[PDB]
């Protein structure tokens, strides 16, 4: 029922600006934080910033202060990201994501033509169907408050947005097959696929939700024979 409609693409040139739109339906738009995430080919995912639509409070990552500005239209249930002074390096897919990076829009590709460290391993892996797959994610600081590990796991099939598999380290998200099992605590976390299937070809990211910049891991590029 929840949907985040983003335009497919924008074509822009250096020094110009573009305003990206995210249309939210199926939930109470005023009560959920909205994040924006950039994904550039050859770079992982980095958080840009977030807007709380209910009062307009914002927080910006350093690389997007003076580069991004976030706004809301209460009445249309639409979030906006303004990118200033465009350059070649701003070419990326741009995501809006709701809550603790729980639901992601499908992302807008813009083409400009004419503190916490998360170590994920292995960076790529090739397994056969039926085998057990183990992906680890190690955090430079504890992500525990106590109970409650601020850590999630995502699956990104090629050309699609990331899709939350497990949140708070061990809680499988609604709809996820039971073959996906998250475990761990503090700094060492694991995502286990008890018996992989072919559909499971995807890129698997961990992300900490403790504090900004809500940093993602480098991913595990998982392929199935």
């Amino acid at each position: 029922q929840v949907q985040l409609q983003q335009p497919g693409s924008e074509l822009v040139r250096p020094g110009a600006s573009v305003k990206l739109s995210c249309k939210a339906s199926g939930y109470t738009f005023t009560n959920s934080w909205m994040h924006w995430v950039k994904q550039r080919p050859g770079q992982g995912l980095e958080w840009i910033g977030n807007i709380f639509p209910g009062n307009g409070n914002t927080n910006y990552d350093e690389n997007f202060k003076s580069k991004a500005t976030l706004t809301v239209d209460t009445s249309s249930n639409t979030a906006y990201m303004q990118l200033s002074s465009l350059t070649s390096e701003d070419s990326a897919v741009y995501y809006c994501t709701r809550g603790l990076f729980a639901y992601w829009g499908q992302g807008t590709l813009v083409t400009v033509s004419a503190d916490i460290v998360m170590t994920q391993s292995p960076s790529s892996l090739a397994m056969s169907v039926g085998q057990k797959v183990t992906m680890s994610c190690k955090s430079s600081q504890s992500l525990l408050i106590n109970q409650k590990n601020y850590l999630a796991w995502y699956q990104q099939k090629p050309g699609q947005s990331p899709k939350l598999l497990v949140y708070f380290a061990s809680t499988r998200e609604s709809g996820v097959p039971d073959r996906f099992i998250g475990s761990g605590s503090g700094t060492d976390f694991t995502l286990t696929i008890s018996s992989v299937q072919a559909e499971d070809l995807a890129d698997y990211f961990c992300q900490q939700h403790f504090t900004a910049p809500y940093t993602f891991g480098g991913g595990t590029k998982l392929e199935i024979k």
Binding site: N31, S32, W33, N50, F52, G99, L100, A102, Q147, F168
Partner: peptide, 13 residues
Amino acid sequence: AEVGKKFEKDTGI
């Protein structure tokens, strides 16, 4: 608290 963690995941609160 499990209801509150579904709430937090969903809203960021």
